[model samples]
Target: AQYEDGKQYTTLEKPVAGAPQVLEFFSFFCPHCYQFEEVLHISDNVKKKLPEGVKMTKYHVNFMGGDLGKDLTQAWAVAMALGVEDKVTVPLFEGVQKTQTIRSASDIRDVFINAGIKGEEYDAAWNSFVVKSLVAQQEKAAADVQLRGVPAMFVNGKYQLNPQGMDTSNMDVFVQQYADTVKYLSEK
Candidate 1:
């Protein structure tokens, strides 16, 4: 089917400016999100494949309640605020998916520390007003998207990629479809 088909992607009521926005709604505690890391490799292939004038942003989802969700969301926001998410994203995912070691803010803090983030730097960003604001803003953005789960992708604030319906038998096929879909929407 064509990428522009309504069944494939829902067009945004108001498209974002300055290049198309590809927002990945994810969570550090989500197993699927962790697995998607292998598929996209956020710091590498995904970034490498994006066409010119396309901007991607990762938003930490808080659909899961309780301390796990809250702490991880804040931790992710702090990392984004400090501009260290690129360094800590994979580690945080591994900390949850592989080791099951991240149990609290302290645990997340330790992960950053181990990644070479100084105590003061981590603390300042973790507790900073900007981080708190970003957490709230991201929460609102997630709510606006009405996401059903982690690992959901939105193009230009509309058009969620239908992962369940994609051909996942081969990862390369899925990745190509994803890129083609985004590129199609971005050009619109």
Candidate 2:
């Protein structure tokens, strides 16, 4: 499946341009996204194996139930606003997956601090336009993308991987399929 290229705003309040783009739509509070985080890291390794100019972006989608969802969403926005997406995304995912105490903003802040982001910067970033814009943009993108689940992928401006009846239980295989498909598209 191919997705159209355009300026898609990230949950971090950044204008993400699509072109040779691999948008991995995810949510920090999502168990599935947490599970797929490893695969995403592997995908990053694969990305390094490829030629330059092939940009892969991760979009944090927040449409879950609970305050933790909101907190994760806020953290995403904050990180983006602070120009620290590279710093926080992986740590946040790892923290959520590896710990049982990650059920609140405070818990997430611990992860951010552990990831080396300053506490004051984290708080200020969350309250900044970066977070607000990121959250708003993600909501708009979710509606436009018509997403039904986390860990969805869009390649270029014409490919989609999350289809109805797809076997989500075996996500690693599916994610690899997505990665291969993206590699194929990039080559073309």
Candidate 3:
């Protein structure tokens, strides 16, 4: 899990208070992020492997500022607010990447309903002031990190995994590398 300086990952000048924060910056419209969703599986097994006290957060990047990205970011914020991200995350990716028909908030709402969330619940979370504020917080956090792309992993809010340094051809190895790095940082 040892990373070369300025290669596999970069150390942050000021790590967040949590010590080990595993934040993933992603865009729903990004195909690579979609592929990572499929490859990682992101099941309980993935969660169980992390060390204790490590905080994990997923930030939906809205760099494009396009309608679709904005809609998806809102969808993600709502999902997280409702604590249904684990249930809706992959399906959101599938709806956009596989079906290629999730262009609006209504489409995202339908996807959640299909995932067993009540329509009323979706509506409430989608329009909640809490969700809106959370989205704004994520935007500022992304800017603070100087995020430039999707599918980027930041450890402890200071170290960023260099996707370019990974063996992109083998997602299994790539995922393992990511997990190992997280574990290493958590222990430190």
Q: How close is candidate 1 to the true structure, as a TM-score?
A: 0.87
- In model 3, what is the error at residue 48, expressed in angstroms? 3.9
Question: Which scores better on lDDT, 1 or 2?
Answer: 1
By lDDT rank, best first, the candidates go 3, 1, 2
In candidate 2, where is summed lDDT lowest over 10 consecutive residues?
Answer: 4-13
TM per prediction: 0.87, 0.71, 0.87
lDDT of 3 by residue, 66-159 (tens): 8888888888898888898888888888888888778777888898999999998888888899999989977877877777887777777768
Clashes of each: 0, 11, 0
Clashes (candidate 1): 0
Model 2 bad stretches (over 4 Å): 1-20, 39-42, 49-51, 162-177
Give lDDT for model 1: 0.75
lDDT to native, each model? 0.75, 0.64, 0.75
